[PDB]
Design a protein around this ligand. Structure first.
Ligand SMILES: [Cu+2]
Ligand SMILES: [Cu+2]
Ligand code: NA
Ligand code: NA
Lengths: 620, 620
C-alpha cells in the first residue's frame, strides 16, 4: 500500500508491456535506466499513481528518448527525444563493455601495437572506460568509450597485475568503429602475478583465528512491514533501491513520546567520481562517475551470510530492469541487521553512590557494488541516541600502470615495474532535509577565539558564531577544520522546551576536495566536488549534483546551474549536498588486493530533543 | 621473568618496607605517586633490576621528596628534596579531597554565603578542584584546592543539577585554612532534578531491545603469558599499567614471516587537560590536568562483565599503592577481547571469475576512569592489517553553572536556569617510536596541487611532497586538513623490497587545538596543547609533556623546554607527541547524563610490508 514500496517484478513487466505496445521498445531499443519516481510534494496525496522514468537507447543511431509511464493506469505519460550533443549521452550499457575488446581485436592498428610487444591478442583484456569531454571535436554527439589493455596469462589470472602502458584506443560503440589508436611507446609489461588466491603468494593460511559467534536468540529488535518499512528503537524509515543511486532512505523519522518527528525526507549518495591524477596522455582523461555514468545499483553484489554480513541478517532482494525490460532480481542485495556499539553512557557518582552503565546499538543498512577493479560498500547507520551516519568502504584492486624508469611524481610503485596512479574517490550525499517538517534553514557554526582583556582578564574564554545561509548564491561553503566548522540544519518554527529552534549538526571529516586545476574538464563536469557543502531549494527535477545525463556532458550541469537561480533558503524546503572523499596515494600494502579504507559523515541532534533521548534504555 | 611485567602486590609491599627501613616513610609521610621505571636503553642491560619511582608528601609541611628504589636489591638509589615553589607541587592526594567540604562547613564566611541563599550546609556538596597558578601570591609554595558548591536534595540526588553559582572558596589543605571566600552575588539554584534513574524522568523503560549474544565457542584467539604479554594475529606486545598514565603499551611488534619487527617501543596518553572557557571569576581558573594532577589510573573503574565489556573477556587486575604504601588491587580494571570488524578485503572479478571476501577483526585493550563528574574510556585497537588506533570515549555528567538571565556567549542552556560552560578535552599521546628498530625519522606529507600547463595539459595532475624534520627546533607542527597533511615515521636504514624506507603514517582527526589566549596561564602550563605534533629526541627523563610536577606549577617545564635542546632527530631514537581533543559546546541532549562522544588517531603501515600483510587470512 505504501507509495515508497520497492519496485516489484510485476511492475517492471507491466512497464515493458506498456513500452512495447506504444511502439517504444523495438529490437533496436535498449533500456539504459529504469526507476520509480518519488511522489511529488503533497501531504494529502491519497490516490496511488506508481510512475516509472525510463531512458531508452537506440543501437541503430536514432535519437534516444526519456519516457515516463504510469504502471497504475497502463499509459505513457510523456516521451521526449533527446539531443545528446546538448544535454549529454545516456549511461553506459553493460552490453557495450564487451564491444570494445571485440572491435579492437580486429583493428589493424591495435594488432600491430600488440605484435610489437609480443602479446597474444587472445590474452589481452580491455577495460572499457567512460570518455569524458576533451579536445576531440569528432566525438561530440557520438557514444565513445576508451579502452586500456591488461594481459591475462591464463583464465583465472588477475589481469590488473599486467597493464600494457603506452597504449590507448577510442571506440564509437554505435557505429562500431575504432576512431583512434594512440601508441606513445613500449613499456615492459609487469611480470609478477597478483593472484591473492595462489598458495605460492599467500603462504600457508593462518590457523590461529578462533570463531566469533554473533547470534540473536530472540530474533532482531527491528520489524519489517510492507516489504521495506523499518521500525527500530524509535526510528521509522523506508528502504528504497534505485538502479542509479543504490540504496535510498526515505521518511527518516524518530518517535519522540507520541509524536513521529521527521528528520530527513530522502537520503542518498547522488554521485560518486573517481578522478585520476596522472598527466600521461594514456590516462589523463580518466574519470569515473560510478553513479552517473555506470549506475552503481545495477552492479550490486549478492551478499553471503557469514562472510559479507555476519549476525542475524534480514535481506532485501531488489528488482531492476535488464536492457530489454525483463525484471532481474538481485538476490540478497541489501543486508539489514543491528550491532552492539559499546558503551552508550556511563557514570559512577561519588556523592549519590549510583553506578550507571548503558550499552549502545546501531541499525546497519548496507550494500556492495563492483565496478571493474573497484568494490565499494555503502553503509547507513542509525544509533540509539539519534545519530545518523554514512560510511563508504573502498576495497578491490587498485588501477595500475607501468612504473616509469626514473620514478614519477604522480604514480606509486607497488611491485617491480608496476605502478598505481594517484586518484581520489569523491562522493556527494544528497540530503532532502525535513527537520520537524519542511521549513528548514542551515547555519554555519565556527569556533570564535577571544583575546585576553576586559571581560576576559584571564584569557580563557572562547565562544562560537552562527551564520544563517539565506540565499543559494551564498550557500556554497568550504570546510575549515581549524575553526571546528560544522553546519546546523534547524527548523525556525519548531522550538524545544528552552524556546530554541530544533536542529541537527552535520560533522564532516574535512578531507580534501577535488584537486584538479579549476580550468580542467573534470572540474567543470564534477563542479560539486570542488566545495564541501551546497544548499539548494527543493525542486522535483533537481535530482543529481551532475545533472541527469552525465556521460560525455561538456560541463556545468547540476549544482552550478541549480545554485544560479539564487532562491530563498531561509526557512524553506531545502536540500543539503555534502561532498566528501578519499585522496588515495596507493601504498605497497594495497597490493595485490586492497584492505578496506573508509570515509563518511554523520549528523547529530542539536537541541532536537528536550533532554537525552536514551534515558529509557534498560540496563540489560 | 619479563622486565615489563605488571607490578605485584609483593613489590609494592617491598617498596614500603625499603622506604620504612631507610627512614623515609614515617607516620607523617604519604605516597602521592608510585610506579615502576622502564628499563634504560640497552638490550639485556644489568641482568634485571626492578626500580620504582616514588613521590613522598609530608603532612606536617616539610619538603616532599622524590625517591628511586631498587626492589630487587632492597636499596634506595636516590632521594632528593623538592622545592615545590620552584618545580611544582605533588599530585593531589585522595584524602585531601575530603578535607575541603569539611573545612568550609565551619568557616563563617562560607556559612554566611549559604545563609544568604537559604541553603542548608548539610545538603551542600563541594567539588574540590585543582587550583592552577593565578594572581594569588599567598598560594606560592602551598597546596591549594578550590571548591565549587552543589546542592544535594537527598542522599541519592544528582548534585550536578543544582550548582550554587556566584561562590567559590580556596583552601590550604596542609595547614587546614580557608584562605579566601569569594561571593559575587546570589544566583537562583536550578530546581529541576537530574536523576537519570528516576522513573518520573525516564518514563517506562523500553521493552523492545532483543539480546545480542557475542560468544567465542573455542575461546579467544589471543594468548596471555607472563601475566601481561599478548600474542594475537601476528602482533606481540606487553600491557603495562601506571597509576598516572593508566594503561601503557610496551614493545608493540609484528611477526612478519620469521622476524619480529618492532613498531612502537612505548605508547601512552601522557597528559590530558580540560580547560574551561567561561570568563566568570567563579570558574575562569578551572583547568583539569586529569593525568598530571589527579592520576587517572588511581580512579580506574572495576569493569563488569556483560555491561562494560561484552563478549569473551580476559581481565587484568593491576595493583597500585595506597597513600601508605599498601598494595591495592583494581579488580577487573582492564578488559581485553577481540571484536569482529566487518569486511577486510573484497573483490568480485569479471575476467577471472574469482569472488573473494575476507573479514577483519581488532584486538581491544580498554579501561575506564572516573574523576568527579566526568568518566573517560581509553581504548587501544590493533587490527589485522597492521593499523593501530587509539580512541577516547567521553561520558559522565557535564559540569554545570547557572544560566544567566540575559544569556551568555560562553555557556549553553541545558534546562531552566541551568547552564553548562564551554570547554575542551585535550589529550597528548606519547609514542616512543621504533619502526623496525630505533633509527627513525619523521616526514610531513602534504598534497600538492598542480597548475594546468606544459606537462599537465589537461589540468588533472596532483602530487605530494614530503619534508624531513631534521632538528627539534623545526619539529613543532600544525595540522592542515585542507592539504591532507599527515606525518610519516620511517626507518631510513630499513628498506622494503622496492628499496623504499619502511614507514607508518599518522592520521589525525584535525580537531581544534587549545583555544585560550596564548598569554593565558593555561596556554603556558599546557603549551603542548597549542600544536598538533611535536618530535623530540628520546631521553630517559623526558616523560610527560607538562613535566613531572604539574600541580600548581607555572610554565617552564615540559615540551617547550625539551625542544630548546635542538637535538638531531634525522635517523635517531625519537618520540612523537600528538595533541588531539574535543571542543565541547554542550547540547540539551547531553543532559542529564551525556551520551558518549569520541576522538582519537590512528597509524597505518606505509610501505612497512612488501605487500598486503593479510593475504594469509582464511575464509572460515
Ligand atoms: Cu583508490
Ligand atoms: Cu565535555
Ligand atoms: Na527539504
Ligand atoms: Na624511539
Amino acid at each position: 500500500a505504501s507509495p515508497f514500496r520497492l519496485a516489484s517484478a510485476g511492475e517492471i513487466s507491466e512497464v515493458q508491456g506498456i513500452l512495447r505496445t506504444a511502439g517504444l521498445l523495438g529490437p533496436e531499443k535498449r533500456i539504459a535506466y529504469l526507476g520509480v519516481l518519488d511522489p511529488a510534494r503533497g501531504a494529502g496525496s491519497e490516490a496511488e499513481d506508481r510512475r516509472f522514468r525510463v531512458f531508452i537507447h537506440d543501437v541503430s543511431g536514432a535519437r534516444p528518448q526519456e519516457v515516463t509511464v504510469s504502471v497504475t493506469n497502463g499509459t505513457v505519460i510523456s516521451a521526449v527525444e533527446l539531443d545528446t550533443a546538448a544535454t549529454g549521452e545516456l549511461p553506459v550499457l553493460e552490453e557495450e563493455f564487451e564491444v570494445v575488446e571485440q572491435l579492437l581485436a580486429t583493428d589493424e592498428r591495435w594488432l600491430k601495437a600488440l605484435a610489437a610487444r609480443n602479446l597474444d591478442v587472445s590474452k589481452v583484456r580491455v577495460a572499457p572506460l567512460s570518455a569524458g569531454v576533451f579536445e576531440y571535436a569528432e566525438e561530440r554527439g557520438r557514444r565513445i568509450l576508451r579502452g586500456l589493455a591488461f594481459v591475462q596469462d591464463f583464465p583465472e589470472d588477475s589481469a590488473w597485475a599486467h597493464p600494457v602502458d603506452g597504449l590507448v584506443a577510442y571506440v564509437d560503440v554505435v557505429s562500431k568503429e575504432v576512431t583512434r589508436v594512440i601508441d606513445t611507446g613500449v613499456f615492459p609489461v609487469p611480470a609478477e602475478h597478483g593472484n591473492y588466491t595462489d598458495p605460492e603468494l599467500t603462504g600457508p593460511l593462518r590457523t590461529t583465528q578462533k570463531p566469533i559467534s554473533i547470534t540473536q536468540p530472540e530474533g532482531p529488535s527491528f520489524t519489517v512491514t510492507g516489504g521495506n518499512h523499518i521500525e527500530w528503537e524509535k526510528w521509522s524509515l523506508d528502504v528504497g533501491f534505485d538502479v542509479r543511486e543504490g540504496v535510498v532512505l526515505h521518511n527518516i523519522a524518530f518517535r519522540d513520546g507520541d509524536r513521529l518527528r521527521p528528520i530527513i525526507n530522502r537520503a542518498s549518495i547522488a554521485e560518486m567520481v573517481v578522478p585520476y591524477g596522472d598527466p600521461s596522455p594514456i590516462r589523463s582523461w580518466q574519470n569515473y562517475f560510478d553513479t552517473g555514468e555506470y549506475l552503481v545499483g545495477q552492479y550490486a553484489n549478492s551478499l553471503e551470510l557469514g562472510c559479507d554480513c555476519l549476525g542475524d541478517i534480514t535481506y532485501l532482494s531488489p528488482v531492476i530492469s535488464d536492457a530489454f525490460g525483463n525484471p532481474r532480481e538481485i538476490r540478497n542485495g541489501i543486508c539489514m541487521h543491528e550491532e552492539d556499539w559499546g558503551i552508550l553512557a556511563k557514570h559512577s557518582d561519588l556523592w549519590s553512590g549510583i553506578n550507571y552503565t548503558r550499552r549502545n546499538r546501531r541499525m546497519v543498512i548496507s550494500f556492495f557494488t563492483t565496478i571493474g577493479n573497484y568494490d565499494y560498500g555503502f553503509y547507513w547507520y542509525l544509533y540509539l541516541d539519534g545519530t545518523i551516519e554514512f560510511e563508504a568502504k573502498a576495497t578491490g584492486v587498485v588501477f595500475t600502470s607501468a612504473f616509469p624508469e626514473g620514478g614519477s611524481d604522480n604514480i606509486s610503485q607497488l611491485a617491480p615495474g608496476l605502478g598505481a596512479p594517484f586518484h581520489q574517490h569523491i562522493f556527494s550525499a544528497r540530503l532532502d532535509m525535513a527537520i520537524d517538517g519542511f521549513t528548514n534553514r542551515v547555519e554555519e557554526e565556527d569556533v570564535v577565539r577571544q583575546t585576553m582583556g576586559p571581560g576576559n582578564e584571564r584569557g580563557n574564554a572562547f565562544s562560537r558564531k552562527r551564520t544563517v545561509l539565506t540565499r543559494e548564491s551564498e550557500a556554497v561553503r568550504e570546510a575549515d577544520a581549524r575553526t571546528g566548522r560544522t553546519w546546523i540544519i534547524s527548523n525556525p518554527e519548531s522550538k524545544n522546551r528552552l524556546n530554541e529552534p530544533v536542529g541537527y549538526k552535520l560533522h564532516a571529516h574535512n578531507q580534501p576536495t577535488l584537486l584538479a586545476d579549476p580550468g580542467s574538464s573534470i572540474a567543470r563536469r564534477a563542479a560539486f566536488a570542488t566545495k564541501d557543502l551546497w544548499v539548494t531549494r527543493y525542486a522535483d527535477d533537481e535530482r543529481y549534483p551532475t545533472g541527469d545525463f552525465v556521460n560525455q556532458h561538456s560541463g556545468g550541469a547540476g549544482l552550478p546551474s541549480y545554485i544560479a537561480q539564487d532562491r530563498d533558503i531561509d526557512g524553506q524546503d531545502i536540500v543539503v549536498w555534502h561532498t566528501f572523499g578519499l585522496t588515495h596515494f596507493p601504498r605497497v600494502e594495497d597490493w595485490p588486493i586492497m584492505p578496506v579504507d573508509t570515509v563518511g559523515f554523520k549528523l547529530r541532534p542539536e537541541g532536537f530533543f528536550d533532554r537525552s533521548p536514551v534515558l529509557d534504555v534498560p540496563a540489560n
